[PDB]
Amino acid sequence: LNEHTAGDTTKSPYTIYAGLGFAVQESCYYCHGNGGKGTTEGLIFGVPDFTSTEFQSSMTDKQIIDHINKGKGKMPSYQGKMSPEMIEKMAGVVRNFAVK
Amino acid sequence: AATQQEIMKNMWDPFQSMRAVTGLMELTSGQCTQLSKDAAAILAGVKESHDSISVDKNYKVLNDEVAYHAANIDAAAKANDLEEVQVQFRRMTIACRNCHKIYKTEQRLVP
Numbered sequence: 268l269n270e271h272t273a274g275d276t277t278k279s280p281y282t283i284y285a286g287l288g289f290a291v292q293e294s295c296y297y298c299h300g301n302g303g304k305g306t307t308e309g310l311i312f313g314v315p316d317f318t319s320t321e322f323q324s325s326m327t328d329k330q331i332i333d334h335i336n337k338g339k340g341k342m343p344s345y346q347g348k349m350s351p352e353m354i355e356k357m358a359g360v361v362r363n364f365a366v367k
Numbered sequence: 368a369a370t371q372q373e374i375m376k377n378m379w380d381p382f383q384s385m386r387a388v389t390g391l392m393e394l395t396s397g398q399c400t401q402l403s404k405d406a407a408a409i410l411a412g413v414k415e416s417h418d419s420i421s422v423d424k425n426y427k428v429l430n431d432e433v434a435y436h437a438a439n440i441d442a443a444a445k446a447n448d449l450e451e452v453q454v455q456f457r458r459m460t461i462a463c464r465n466c467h468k469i470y471k472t473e474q475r476l477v478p
């Protein structure tokens with residue numbers, strides 16, 4: 268993965284995760300907030316815990332990219348809603364919640 | 368070792384000091400000076416968090432993006448470029464909010 272380097276918030280994956288250009292119920296933080304552990308609403312849909320080493324070892328880097336693109340159930344699809352380059356930056360955000 | 372809330376208050380006071388001057392037309396040296404002092408305070412906040420508050424890698428990079436804009440505000444105050452001070456303050460405000468929304472999602476927080 269090409270990890271994102273800190274920079275201008277207008278180009279940042281965190282501004283997108285925080286809902287820029289999305290309705291609230293399609294913003295990553297609405298379901299995967301609380302530092303990646305999941306929110307009340309997210310948990311009701313069954314979000315995993317991004318901070319859990321157990322969860323992180325259940326997926327490869329490529330599977331993270333593929334599942335953000337395609338969605339699955341209550342997890343919306345994001346292909347066409349952000350660039351392939353932003354999705355890859357986003358896979359790094361997902362990975363980073365488990366890094367101390 | 369500072370706490371999270373303490374660091375947050377250490378950034379809040381210069382933040383509002385910064386905010387009060389972004390909508391001016393002015394170039395007062397004492398104001399340009401207060402701006403660079405406020406920017407240095409906010410930067411010290413991110414460096415102090417790194418030194419003492421370990422959470423995860425995203426937490427750290429989010430602080431870096433606050434620091435990115437804070438340093439740009441310092442650079443723009445020095446060049447007496449207040450259009451740029453304004454734009455960088457707006458983007459720094461987004462950087463504060465990104466972390467708030469991601470790590471304290473179910474609570475309303477300033478800015």
Ligand code: HEC
Pocket residue numbers: 284292293294295296297298299309312313314315331334335338339340341342343345357361
């Ligand atoms: C609630 C409406 C959600 C929003 C907004 C986002 N996600 Fe999600 N995510 C959600 C659920 C219920 C699940 C589990 C899906 C399942 O049943 O398996 C997920 C899962 C993921 C995963 C892991 C891959 C997977 O389990 O299929 C990733 C990497 C992920 N989600 C990323 C992600 C991103 C990047 C989002 C913002 C663009 C995002 N999710 C929003 C629920 C919801």
Ligand code: HEC
Pocket residue numbers: 371372375376378379382409426427429430433459462463464466467470471476477478
């Ligand atoms: C994550 C890396 C953060 C960044 C960047 C900023 N803040 Fe923050 N802040 C963060 C958290 C997790 C919390 C909740 C802490 C808690 O007490 O539960 C906060 C809170 C604040 C507060 C209010 C704290 C209080 O007095 O109760 C303020 C005033 C605040 N944050 C200000 C602030 C500003 C101005 C920032 C950008 C310059 C900023 N924070 C960035 C985490 C993070």
